[PDB]
Amino acid sequence: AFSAPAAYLTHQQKVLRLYKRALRHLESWCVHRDKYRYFACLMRARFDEHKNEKDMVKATQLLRQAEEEFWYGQHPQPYIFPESPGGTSYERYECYKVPEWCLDDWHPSEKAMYPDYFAKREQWKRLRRESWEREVKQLQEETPPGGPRTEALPPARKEGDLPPLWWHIVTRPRERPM
Amino acid sequence: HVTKDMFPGPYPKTPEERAAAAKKYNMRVEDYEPYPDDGMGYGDYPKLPDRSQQERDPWYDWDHPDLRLNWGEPIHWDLDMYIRNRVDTSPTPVSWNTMCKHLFGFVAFMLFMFWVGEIYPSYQPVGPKQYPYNDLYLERGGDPTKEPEPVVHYEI
Amino acid sequence: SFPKYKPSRLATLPATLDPAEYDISPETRKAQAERLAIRSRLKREYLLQYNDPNRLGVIEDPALIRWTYARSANIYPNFRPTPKTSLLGALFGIGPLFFWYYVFKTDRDKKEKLIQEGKLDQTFNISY
Amino acid sequence: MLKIIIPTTMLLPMTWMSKHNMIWINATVHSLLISLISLSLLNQLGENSLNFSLTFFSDSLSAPLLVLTTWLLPLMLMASQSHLSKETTTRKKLYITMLILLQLFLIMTFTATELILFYILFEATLVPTLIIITRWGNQTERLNAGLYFLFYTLAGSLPLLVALVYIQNTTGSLNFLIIHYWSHPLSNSWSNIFMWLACIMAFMVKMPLYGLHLWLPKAHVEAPIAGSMVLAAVLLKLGGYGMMRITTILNPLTNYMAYPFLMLSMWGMIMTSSICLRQTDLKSLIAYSSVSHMALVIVAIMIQTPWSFMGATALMIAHGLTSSMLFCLANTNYERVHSRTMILARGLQTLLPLMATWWLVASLTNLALPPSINLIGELFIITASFSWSNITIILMGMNMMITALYSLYMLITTQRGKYTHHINNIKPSFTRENALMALHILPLLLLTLNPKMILGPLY
Amino acid sequence: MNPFASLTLTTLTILTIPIMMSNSNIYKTNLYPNYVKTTVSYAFTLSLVPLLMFMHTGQEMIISNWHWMTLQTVELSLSFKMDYFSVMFIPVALFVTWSIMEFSMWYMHSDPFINRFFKYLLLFLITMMILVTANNLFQLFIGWEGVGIMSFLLIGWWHGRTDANTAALQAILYNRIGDIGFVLSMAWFLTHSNAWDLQQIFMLNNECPNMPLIGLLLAAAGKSAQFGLHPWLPSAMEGPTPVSALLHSSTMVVAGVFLLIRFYPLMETNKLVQTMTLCLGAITTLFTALCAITQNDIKKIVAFSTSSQLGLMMVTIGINQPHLAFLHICMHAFFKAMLFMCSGSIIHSLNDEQDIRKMGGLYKAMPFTTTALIIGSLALTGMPYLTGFYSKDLIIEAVNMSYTNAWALLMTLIATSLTAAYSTRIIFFAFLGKPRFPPLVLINENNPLLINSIKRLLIGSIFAGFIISNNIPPMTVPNTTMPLYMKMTALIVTIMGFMLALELNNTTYYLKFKYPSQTYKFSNMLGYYPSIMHRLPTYHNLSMSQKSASSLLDLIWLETILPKTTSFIQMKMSIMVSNQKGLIKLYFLSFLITIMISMTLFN
Numbered sequence A: 001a002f003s004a005p006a007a008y009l010t011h012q013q014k015v016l017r018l019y020k021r022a023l024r025h026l027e028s029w030c031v032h033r034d035k036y037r038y039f040a041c042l043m044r045a046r047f048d049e050h051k052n053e054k055d056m057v058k059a060t061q062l063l064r065q066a067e068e069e070f071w072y073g074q075h076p077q078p079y080i081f082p083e084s085p086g087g088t089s090y091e092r093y094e095c096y097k098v099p100e101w102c103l104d105d106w107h108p109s110e111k112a113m114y115p116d117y118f119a120k121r122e123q124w125k126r127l128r129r130e131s132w133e134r135e136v137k138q139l140q141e142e143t144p145p146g147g148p149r150t151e152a153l154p155p156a157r158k159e160g161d162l163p164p165l166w167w168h169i170v171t172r173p174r175e176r177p178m
Numbered sequence B: 001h002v003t004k005d006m007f008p009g010p011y012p013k014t015p016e017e018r019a020a021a022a023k024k025y026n027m028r029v030e031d032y033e034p035y036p037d038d039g040m041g042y043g044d045y046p047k048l049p050d051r052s053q054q055e056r057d058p059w060y061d062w063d064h065p066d067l068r069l070n071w072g073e074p075i076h077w078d079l080d081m082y083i084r085n086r087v088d089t090s091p092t093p094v095s096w097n098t099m100c101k102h103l104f105g106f107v108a109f110m111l112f113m114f115w116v117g118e119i120y121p122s123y124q125p126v127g128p129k130q131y132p133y134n135d136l137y138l139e140r141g142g143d144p145t146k147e148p149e150p151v152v153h154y155e156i
Numbered sequence C: 001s002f003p004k005y006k007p008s009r010l011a012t013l014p015a016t017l018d019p020a021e022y023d024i025s026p027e028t029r030k031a032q033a034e035r036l037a038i039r040s041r042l043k044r045e046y047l048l049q050y051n052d053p054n055r056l057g058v059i060e061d062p063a064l065i066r067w068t069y070a071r072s073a074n075i076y077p078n079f080r081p082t083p084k085t086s087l088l089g090a091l092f093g094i095g096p097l098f099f100w101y102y103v104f105k106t107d108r109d110k111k112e113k114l115i116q117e118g119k120l121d122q123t124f125n126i127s128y
Numbered sequence D: 001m002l003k004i005i006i007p008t009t010m011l012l013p014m015t016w017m018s019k020h021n022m023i024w025i026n027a028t029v030h031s032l033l034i035s036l037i038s039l040s041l042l043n044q045l046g047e048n049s050l051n052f053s054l055t056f057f058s059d060s061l062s063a064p065l066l067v068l069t070t071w072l073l074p075l076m077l078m079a080s081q082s083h084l085s086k087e088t089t090t091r092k093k094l095y096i097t098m099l100i101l102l103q104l105f106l107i108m109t110f111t112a113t114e115l116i117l118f119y120i121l122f123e124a125t126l127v128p129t130l131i132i133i134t135r136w137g138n139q140t141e142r143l144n145a146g147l148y149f150l151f152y153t154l155a156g157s158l159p160l161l162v163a164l165v166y167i168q169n170t171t172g173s174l175n176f177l178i179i180h181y182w183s184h185p186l187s188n189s190w191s192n193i194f195m196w197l198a199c200i201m202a203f204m205v206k207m208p209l210y211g212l213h214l215w216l217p218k219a220h221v222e223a224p225i226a227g228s229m230v231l232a233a234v235l236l237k238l239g240g241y242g243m244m245r246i247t248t249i250l251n252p253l254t255n256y257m258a259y260p261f262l263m264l265s266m267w268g269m270i271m272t273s274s275i276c277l278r279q280t281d282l283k284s285l286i287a288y289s290s291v292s293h294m295a296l297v298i299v300a301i302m303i304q305t306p307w308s309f310m311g312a313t314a315l316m317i318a319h320g321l322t323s324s325m326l327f328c329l330a331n332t333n334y335e336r337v338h339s340r341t342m343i344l345a346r347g348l349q350t351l352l353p354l355m356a357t358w359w360l361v362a363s364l365t366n367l368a369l370p371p372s373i374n375l376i377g378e379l380f381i382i383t384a385s386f387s388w389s390n391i392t393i394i395l396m397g398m399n400m401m402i403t404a405l406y407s408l409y410m411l412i413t414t415q416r417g418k419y420t421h422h423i424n425n426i427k428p429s430f431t432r433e434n435a436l437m438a439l440h441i442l443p444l445l446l447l448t449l450n451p452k453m454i455l456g457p458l459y
Numbered sequence E: 001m002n003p004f005a006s007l008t009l010t011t012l013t014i015l016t017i018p019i020m021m022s023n024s025n026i027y028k029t030n031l032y033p034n035y036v037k038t039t040v041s042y043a044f045t046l047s048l049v050p051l052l053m054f055m056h057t058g059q060e061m062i063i064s065n066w067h068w069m070t071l072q073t074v075e076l077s078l079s080f081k082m083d084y085f086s087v088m089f090i091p092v093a094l095f096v097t098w099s100i101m102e103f104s105m106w107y108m109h110s111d112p113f114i115n116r117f118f119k120y121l122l123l124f125l126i127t128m129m130i131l132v133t134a135n136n137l138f139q140l141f142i143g144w145e146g147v148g149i150m151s152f153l154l155i156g157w158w159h160g161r162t163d164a165n166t167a168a169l170q171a172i173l174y175n176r177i178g179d180i181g182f183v184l185s186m187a188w189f190l191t192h193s194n195a196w197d198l199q200q201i202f203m204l205n206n207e208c209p210n211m212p213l214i215g216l217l218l219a220a221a222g223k224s225a226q227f228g229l230h231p232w233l234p235s236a237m238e239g240p241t242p243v244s245a246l247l248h249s250s251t252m253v254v255a256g257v258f259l260l261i262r263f264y265p266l267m268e269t270n271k272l273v274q275t276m277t278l279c280l281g282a283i284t285t286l287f288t289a290l291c292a293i294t295q296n297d298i299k300k301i302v303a304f305s306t307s308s309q310l311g312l313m314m315v316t317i318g319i320n321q322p323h324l325a326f327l328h329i330c331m332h333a334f335f336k337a338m339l340f341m342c343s344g345s346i347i348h349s350l351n352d353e354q355d356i357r358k359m360g361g362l363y364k365a366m367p368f369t370t371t372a373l374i375i376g377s378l379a380l381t382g383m384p385y386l387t388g389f390y391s392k393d394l395i396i397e398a399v400n401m402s403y404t405n406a407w408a409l410l411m412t413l414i415a416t417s418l419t420a421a422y423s424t425r426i427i428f429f430a431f432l433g434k435p436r437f438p439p440l441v442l443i444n445e446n447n448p449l450l451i452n453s454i455k456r457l458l459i460g461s462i463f464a465g466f467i468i469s470n471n472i473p474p475m476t477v478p479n480t481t482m483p484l485y486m487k488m489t490a491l492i493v494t495i496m497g498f499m500l501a502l503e504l505n506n507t508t509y510y511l512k513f514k515y516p517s518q519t520y521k522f523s524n525m526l527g528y529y530p531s532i533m534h535r536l537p538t539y540h541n542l543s544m545s546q547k548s549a550s551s552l553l554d555l556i557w558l559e560t561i562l563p564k565t566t567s568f569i570q571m572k573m574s575i576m577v578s579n580q581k582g583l584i585k586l587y588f589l590s591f592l593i594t595i596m597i598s599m600t601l602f603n
Ligand SMILES: CCCCCCCCCCCCCCCCCC(=O)OC[C@H](COP(=O)([O-])OCC(O)COP(=O)([O-])OC[C@@H](COC(=O)CCCCCCCCCCCCCCCCC)OC(=O)CCCCCCCCCCCCCCCCC)OC(=O)CCCCCCCCCCCCCCCCC
Pocket: B105, B106, B108, B109, B110, E290, E293, E294, E413, E414, E417, E418, E421, E425, E493, E496, E497, E500, E501, E504, E505, E508, E514, E515, E516, E517, E519, E520, E523
């Protein structure tokens, strides 16, 4: 989510992802805590018998057959956290997220209420106004010729500088705005 | 604010115009494949995998999080068919053929057994209920000017 | 020795079951790198156009306009009368019409015949 | 009838003599006053008709259409007030002149005691609409659209004129009263077949019939908001009014000449309802929904039963109101997005809640929710078709389902979901737009209290 | 004079006052939910009187107050029917709605738009009252569509969630599939009987043909979520828990069964429609119970329980016992609404968790909900002398002693056993084991609203069955004699279901793991019906909607035939005519040719 993706996933990453998926579906299968702990230790052991495999052409055949086994017993109704992309409350509060720029359209009668918040709002707007002009130059000078290769942005390197393209990340509405 | 060159064109039939079209849709040259040059006018537009947009990565920071879409990337021809609110081609735990066989076998077996049970009903070792007044002739239909044949019931 | 998963059109094949995500070659890695590079270029362009405080409008997406034009206003200029196209058009534009015409004509012929001969029990059929 | 025609004519000098910053107020106020005056025609009688003079007469089929036509103009003026702001005073006066001329032509067309005058005004309505479409249209395709909107119509109606004069050479008159009282059957002959075709194809093309509807998406998409209003609300009902007026002489030939048109309409309703499901444009979706509803009305007219006529009239009125409101909502969205694409603007109920409520009500009215007059016409036509044939319901039922689908689809894609992040020019809805929405929607819910006002002469 | 009609209309009209007040100042304060709850309670108290009058005398009435319109020989008027079913079902629905609103005042406290939620609930209640009290087919259709629209608006309560919108559209689609049959029935009734009024329909139909009853059965299957059109009810649980507790559990879903009950004079004259109804109910209840036995979401399991109960009531309709089906409606309302309320309390106390894999020891951690759910599950399984026994036991006795399909009887017995089994599953997996939730314990039931709302439904599910059964006149012949084994068949099968479900559930404690079988995969995936039927048809339709209708026909061939061919022909003719080099040689050669041809041709 917050981290930029890479061009490809290494064997280590695929092994870790398979291990996590297997553990999650095992705890979905093994409802109780003691049974899950026993079978998770057993599956970690059976996953550990081939840690020190040296040749890559044989270690890729082990994970390839492990992905054929996981699919067969993958518990077609797994446990999903409520806020996860499959959970029951995934995007429940997504309609309560109102953008900050909407406050620019408030009537002056409504802006009479909450004066300190709006004063801080022009303060933030001015800060962004100078920061963006700095960041355009910083990102233009730091980019390699021909365009970026990965969508990872550099931080701020001077004293008064701010990280390039920061306005829409720090001004997230909230997790539960209302 | 879009140039004439940018818009879709005829089917790319030569390698140079194929490369130009691939560059136009913001994709790799060997990753670009147009629809077959049949009568239907797909033309210049590229053919993307028929994968649904429900199965796209839900953790990548898409520019359109609801649609799981990115700014600039070529949109699938049938995007409106695959919008997470419609048909999705996400892989299932059980193969499609096996699910189809199981579903239709269950339905056919249920229908056949219902028909069989209709052939062989279930009842009680009793005779029909007896109603006194000429099988309730007056209270069921009426017509009191015909005097139907009387029916008497056998007391046992 | 487990049963094998058979992909279908409406139930595709999982990424972890792809037999092409293992037999990796340097050409495949180069292709992935180029894909990431162009994706990052597009993302950088969008983010530069998105965080600008001087922008007070909609960020025009060439891909969206191109998709709409391809779906709407480009179908005819690339149309060519072919046996497949001709047969499909004739079927989908003629067959249903004659099918429904035959069905309704048969039903109404039966109804009119039953009116003429006289056993239809039209009692209480006042409002038509 | 002159007490309404004369003020419509006097609307032109008042507009042309008004100040450069006061034309809209005068036009709106006097149009509303004219509509209030025209409300008097709604007092119809079970007897023959309101025969004002030798030239003009009013019936309970003409009265609701006249009231709707008079009521439409203020809504069109309010809708066009926005996008004509940077327009010069002379060109704004020309636009208002075109609208007033179109209303005058429609008002004279809906009374039209004589058939040749009816045809002349029927074609006179074509000029201001063409000028509006081709002149004040944003996109480059408008000209082509205008061409289509012209030629199709004329291609339909040029034979009709000949047929009309031919009738006056045999019957001797074209007055609708004399035509109705001196009606004689048409024998089964090739000449009578071609006379039937000439009389019917003129009004089939403008309704439009499936297969002749290609001009309608172009004309509605490319026209300005007022043009879309007048085309969807009133200009589509000219074909239905003409067919209900002219089918008095086509019997009993229609009993077997309506089969191709009944089949075409009953399949085209399904085809257009399915087309609405996959559309990248809001205006095209609304236009195809209009095509479906008009195909249902065509089916009703071809059945030729009292319930068919009642349902056809009610459906025409309700569809005109609903399509006008939907086009207004689409234009309100477009004026902020400037793209006219369904999926670019999303999650609008978070930003514009009252507009979301208006969208919900318009979608429900299009969805034919009881006890709206939309469903009154729907059920009347459905029962009449069931009496005509017990199988038609199947098709009808499918249409109903599909209708609801795309309606809610139009409601869900545009209003529900997450808002588009890079669109920050969504200003709060003005009082003008909300007033326009209310003036569109309240008459529907008030007419559902007194349905007999729009059920036609066969009530 | 005549207090019966006045009170019956007054309860309905006072159900409407908060809707009018929704534009006033009270709607902008926090007193609106309490205002609506008090209005509903007062309406229930007022409507308790017509029930007493009917119970004492047997008062029946129809009120035709406002004449809507006269279409030649057919008069449509605002007619209300106040027969046994209406005056009996108004108080039950009002009491359930009052309990659900008092529960919602506590459950939905964090919702910014809570007044809109309450007004939506009241609008649904008004639409259901219109549906129930309708005397003509048009008003019945108005209520039929109003309940569907309210369900659509309440399912997609959270507009941000895509799944909620998908579920709402699915519910609308299935309800419109039912609406097709409803419209068929209305059209046939008006074409043949020349009236949408129930009185004229009953008089003019001594033997009802197949078509109108098939249409009514199709509409009832569409809204009651029978096996053909079932998945929308399980999918409708994306909405808030009170919506599922009120709409999709006890009130809106029984509308199809109520429609079939309203036409019982016409159902007894047809024997094939009864067989179809019996088969549909049996397959529905069996399939839904089999799906429920293996689910892990509590709300989904309770939804499948509701669907199974609806299938059982449809079986009862199919065996020609409408009054018994209405009685089962009345008892199911109470205990299933209370079951959903307990589930919602568990979910709220457990930080918005619905899966039972993260529910552990709640028998002692939160006892009031535990005992309420135990009572509700005992009532559901037809434990003797509870609200569910007095209906379900009679259902079983009637279906055993009827000349009906034997397969349907077997399916009903297996469905009852499976009902006992998944009730055991709920209790075992939600209240018996060790805790499995996150360590931050926030269990709390100490709120007067929740306690009072649950306790009223407890009193209902304990005593209302007895009160109703002993306080209504007899409307069917009793099964006085009974084989001893046949008398206890329901109890035996329910106890066997308890025993087998508990024995199979206790094996999860063992330290043994095994991959699932084919039957488990079939039952857990809802019989594969939601997958295939939501991917094979729709895609194809959508594909056609762009392939044949949109592109091939509208955009290509219909464009090629009339306009483009004309343009091509005119362009070619213009090119041929205007392609003159300007040579007078050719001009006068043509002049000579035409002069020569005219003399020969025209003389
Ligand atoms: C007249 C005398 C009266 C007395 C009569 C005799 C008295 C009773 C005799 C007993 C009879 C059977 C009792 C055994 C009950 C079953 C328990 C069991 O073994 O399940 C475990 C076992 C699988 O366990 P697992 O996968 O290892 O566990 C997964 C984990 O543990 C994860 O597990 P979990 O923790 O997630 O949840 C566990 C859950 C999940 O377990 C499941 O996987 C669900 C599957 C089990 C439900 C089957 C029960 C009823 C089946 C009705 C089927 C109707 C026809 C279907 C048509 C199919 C069409 C192909 O299981 C349960 O909760 C309990 C299961 C149900 C037991 C409670 C009710 C059953 C007792 C009453 C039944 C009959 C007596 C009625 C009395 C009427 C008077 C005569 O299930 C089976 O092996 C299936 C056995 C029966 C299936 C029948 C359908 C076979 C159809 C195949 C095709 C045949 C040819 C068709 C050709 C058609 C061509 C057109």
